[PDB]
Ligand SMILES: S=C(NCCc1ccccc1)Nc1cccnc1
């Protein structure tokens with residue numbers, strides 16, 4: 001029965017995305033084939049089961065560069081990364097396959113389930 | 124156009140608080156009176172105009188310890204910090220004055236406005 005601020009959670013994510021847009025206190029580079037994506041570790045492990053298992057390990061917690069698998073589509077990771085910071089996922093008929101594969105790799109089980117619904121609703 | 128996850132922002136904030144509870148990637152110690160509070164700077168800058176101005180400054184951006192004005196109540200600040208990581212304010216008759224004052228200091232305009240509404244209602 002504490003007083004709840006209905007917008008506070010999304011206003012924090014918005015400001016966090018702004019800090020990423022200005023490159024303020026970002027602490028890791030994600031390398032996907034050729035492309036590089038800078039982000040905050042905390043946001044990364046709060047959304048992805050793979051980044052969680054990487055940074056939860058005290059041995060890997062201080063890494064500033066993560067090389068994803070060479071098979072991982074860079075544009076798919078870019079879509080999922082922007083989803084982490086905005087709650088808005090951009091599924092298209094031309095990217096659904098790459099986005100879903102990337103989601104399973106990053107272990108984002110809710111995004112994977114949504115990708116299936118999108119697939120089922122397009123067959 | 125894009126698919127909106129209505130519970131996503133809230134689930135992210137919940138997982139951030141879990142990281143704070145286990146002290147994973149906490150990167151600053153906020154000291155009030157003599158009590159230490161461990162937090163993530165990004166969460167602090169996103170919720171507080173004070174912590175925004177502090178950590179935007181390249182002189183203080185990477186400091187490990189920030190000491191607040193000793194006029195600030197610790198229990199009150201603990202309530203604002205908890206609200207930062209949860210969206211829930213433990214606003215009570217016996218702490219609203221301390222919570223509002225601490226909110227003004229941290230430059231948290233929305234929490235101040237909500238405090239004044241409850242005072243004006245009484
Ligand atoms: S921070 C955090 N906490 C969840 C705690 C948990 C860890 C593992 C299993 C259940 C809960 N990240 C996370 C972890 C995993 C997936 N997606 C995000």
Ligand SMILES: S=C(NCCc1ccccc1)Nc1cccnc1
Nearest residue numbers: 015016018019168169170171172175
């Ligand atoms: S990240 C951020 N504001 C995003 C950019 C902004 C800077 C200044 C004013 C509005 C927005 N933190 C903040 C700053 C000030 C108050 N409360 C939180």
